[PDB]
Amino acid sequence: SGLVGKLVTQLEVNCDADIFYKIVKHHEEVPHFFTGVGCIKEWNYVLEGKAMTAVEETTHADETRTLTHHITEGDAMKDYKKFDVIVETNPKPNGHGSVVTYSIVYEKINEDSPAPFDYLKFFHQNIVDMSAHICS
Amino acid sequence: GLVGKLVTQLEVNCDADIFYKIVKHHEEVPHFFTGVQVTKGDGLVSGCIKEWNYVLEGKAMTAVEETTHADETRTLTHHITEGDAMKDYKKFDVIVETNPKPNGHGSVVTYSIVYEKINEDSPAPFDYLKFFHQNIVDMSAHIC
């Protein structure tokens, strides 16, 4: 037991859901502007001060405001047999502002593998960083 | 960004109805004050109010926690109202759900921390999430 799991961080953001989805989507594809007009790509990042690399297949779905990253190889694969990251944006139930959900769906390589709390804080911080460019 | 939710979900090998009973029993039962069981008025324990004593990253900690459950959804809720955990949060509720896998053998256990920060400089509860994750691991390793 304990090899298959999911970590989620969900944040409320005072921004329309479709607009925030467009900003997240554009930020990941490139950014001079905040908005822009399958796909395998390199993913280079710094995780708690350590530079890392990955290859990921990405998809997006505009109607559900969902970005998906399926990591196929790289530093994350040292601990995981499977590592998928999903970002979803949805309106708050009232309609003023939105809820942003980052999910990491993972399968550990073995029992001594960590669960990806370090990646969760990393993606959480991405939401915070982008939210900071939005005025209240 | 003051309102959010952190979630850890883990597949374990125990049966869902059994795992729910064990969690529920551990949380509804030597302390500083004597915990109390509560009832809705039918000869059934509906919950408990008690001291939660725990160690979080080296520091001993304490809180007042009220537990409620819903045997039908196999859902348990920890409602924390004062103590160490309330130093960063205006709201801190922990929801534990246990559901069978599709094949019916083993289950999926979900801990969700529903939190509201005091201000923007408050951390999100990643330390608590790792603590609760290890509790799932520890509990299942004890169940045959």
Author numbering:
A (entry chain B): 7 to 36, 41 to 47, 58 to 156
B (entry chain A): 8 to 36, 41 to 155
Paper text:
The contiguous latex includes an abundance of related proteins belonging to the pathogenesis-related (PR)10 family known collectively as major latex proteins (MLPs) and representing at least 35% of the total cellular protein content. Members of the pathogenesis-related (PR)10 family, also known as Bet v 1 or major latex proteins (MLPs), belong to the wider ‘StARkin’ lipid-transfer protein (LTP) classification with diverse physiological roles in plants, including sterol trafficking, lipid ‘sensor’ activity, and modulation of transcription factor function. Using a combination of sucrose density-gradient fractionation-coupled proteomics, differential scanning fluorimetry, isothermal titration calorimetry, and X-ray crystallography, we show that the major latex proteins are a family of alkaloid-binding proteins that display altered conformation in the presence of certain ligands. Seven antiparallel β-strands cradle the C-terminal α-helix with the alkaloid binding pocket located in a hydrophobic pocket between the central C-terminal α-helix and the β-sheet.
In the absence of a bound alkaloid, W63 rotates to occupy the hydrophobic binding pocket. Alkaloid binding leads to the ordering of β2 completing the Bet v 1-fold. Alkaloid binding and subsequent ordering of the β2 strand causes C59 to be buried. S-S bonding is potentially a key factor in the ability of opium poppy latex proteins to bind alkaloids and form dense aggregates.
